[PDB]
Ligand binder design. Structure first.
Ligand SMILES: CCCCCCCCCCCCCCCC(=O)O
Ligand SMILES: CCCCCCCCCCCCCCCC(=O)O
Ligand SMILES: [Fe+2]
Ligand SMILES: [Fe+2]
Ligand SMILES: [Fe+2]
Ligand SMILES: [Fe+2]
Ligand SMILES: [Fe+2]
Ligand SMILES: [Fe+2]
Lengths: 285, 286
């Protein structure tokens, strides 16, 4: 349907808008290119591992590659909905959000290509709980926005995408990866990629917080919706984390070999800690 | 609806895909930031202009600010449609396309702000023909893709967006701006912007050509749709140009004051040339 008029013809960009400022920061701090990352030592590290040590890295990488591809695709209806609402500064920011996610997908796939597992189907490390979140709940919540852009719908989308998938699972995923492979001196190229990714994602979570808070600010009732939507997803979050833990505990060769005492109970509590932290970043008031 | 699986879990990105290669080039050649452009001399240039010289420049800027804003908003359905078809490399590319357009919107708005016309409503320089293309036909063709992603729908969208709006009107707009202010030595910040923008837009048109040609390749009968869609929009293209031309003759001062022969018959023939050139870049067979 038709454009009424255009904001940058009638007026200008709202230069003081928080998402415009976040967009400016994204351009400044968004220059990294996954094509520049040197994965040659990652290839040597991976080839050096035993077959049993080889697999133990794959479940997390499977989770990330699928995760980045999903969020690359699944942000488009948010961008559509806020565009339809005339929120131009939000849309400007979301162009950097989307391109960031494209680089994230690119980075993990380049790592798989480089270490020699591009042809391997990593879907086998997605359990029912992972599928419930990434194959189903995430795309359902986002796609809803094409036909229903109510505050309830926008809060739920931002909750699943920004606060759970990015803010709880991905944040925990980064930590985990550094806790394991940074200590083992493994996969320097991947860890460099993860570092750049973690920086991008700090901006993404700020958009999610801004979006949820601005709606809660309209009506305190939406705060309770936010809490409820977080809690509804927790079982799948922890169900996936438990699955990953149980896998790590059955394939402990890498831990032994590299002196690592992967404290899975520490990782588990970090996930819980992230979940509760996200809740605290939204105020009822 | 659900994801069946994911290409970068089952396999990898198709590293040889034409749109993946275009994506890589975009990242390499797309580092410019409108926020770094010095518009202080543009401000002084604009202030030194006579009132009649001031309104010589504004209709074109009006066309571009609205144009960039429209295409920023209106690419989203194309990205959605291609994503839903599983064309991952196309989607990776389109993230650079979209962020480019965001920078283009930004650049023209920064210029308006800097020269002191941000508070002016430039809508007054969009005539019925401009409105038909940018307020109506473009969003109608793009939004159609949410419910109809047929070959016919995708060709029509790429034709309006990439071949007419970008490849005919915008290409002719860049040229025109340089043919007028580069010679005059005016608005160096804006011209610097236009140059970076023109580089970006080369990639956008390549996506349009690839998309239209990959569909035409499946069935030559789509070639005739392409031509028909181009021709349907021509009356609004030239009708906007005549309105701009009509304005530019009714305002002689910037030309004469700045030593210029703004040859409007030359620019009109640039628009005509761009249009036939776009037609030629698609073949019945390739
Ligand atoms: C063993 C401890 C469990 C740690 C939790 C691991 C979760 C796997 C990570 C997959 C989700 C990635 C989502 C990306 C979101 C974005 O890019 O904005
Ligand atoms: C008198 C000479 C007329 C020349 C034609 C002038 C047309 C004005 C340009 C406005 C269209 C801009 C469209 C944005 C394209 C994109 O950024 O992909
Ligand atoms: Fe990401
Ligand atoms: Fe993200
Ligand atoms: Fe379970
Ligand atoms: Fe543009
Ligand atoms: Fe463009
Ligand atoms: Fe007319």
């Amino acid at each position: 349907v038709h454009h009424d008029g255009f904001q940058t013809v009638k007026a200008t960009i709202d230069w003081e808008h928080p998402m415009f400022k976040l967009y400016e920061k994204a351009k400044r701090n968004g220059k990294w290119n996954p094509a520049d990352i040197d994965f040659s030592q990652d290839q040597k590290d991976f080839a050096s591992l035993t077959s049993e040590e080889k697999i133990s890295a794959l479940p997390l990488v499977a989770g990330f590659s699928a995760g980045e591809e999903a969020v690359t695709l699944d942000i488009l209806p948010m961008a559509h909905a806020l565009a339809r609402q005339g929120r131009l500064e939000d849309v400007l920011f979301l162009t950097t959000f989307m391109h960031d996610e494209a680089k994230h997908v690119e980075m993990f796939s380049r790592w798989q290509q480089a270490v020699g597992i591009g042809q391997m189907d990593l879907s086998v490390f997605h359990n029912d709980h992972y599928k419930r979140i990434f194959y189903e709940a995430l795309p359902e919540a986002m796609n809803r926005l094409y036909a229903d852009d109510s505050p309830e719908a926008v809060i739920r989308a931002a909750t699943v995408y920004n606060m759970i998938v990015e803010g709880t699972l991905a944040e925990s995923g980064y930590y985990t990866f550094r806790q394991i492979y940074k200590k083992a001196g493994l996969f320097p190229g991947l860890l460099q990629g993860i570092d750049y990714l973690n920086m991008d994602e700090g901006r993404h979570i700020q958009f999610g917080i801004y979006t949820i808070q601005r709606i809660v600010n309209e009506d305190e009732r939406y705060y309770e919706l936010f809490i409820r939507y977080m809690d509804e997803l927790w079982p799948h979050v922890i169900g996936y984390v438990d699955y990953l833990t149980e896998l790590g505990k059955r394939q402990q060769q890498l831990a032994r070999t590299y002196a690592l005492e992967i404290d899975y109970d520490l990782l588990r509590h970090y996930v819980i800690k992230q979940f509760n932290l996200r809740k605290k970043q939204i105020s009822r008031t």
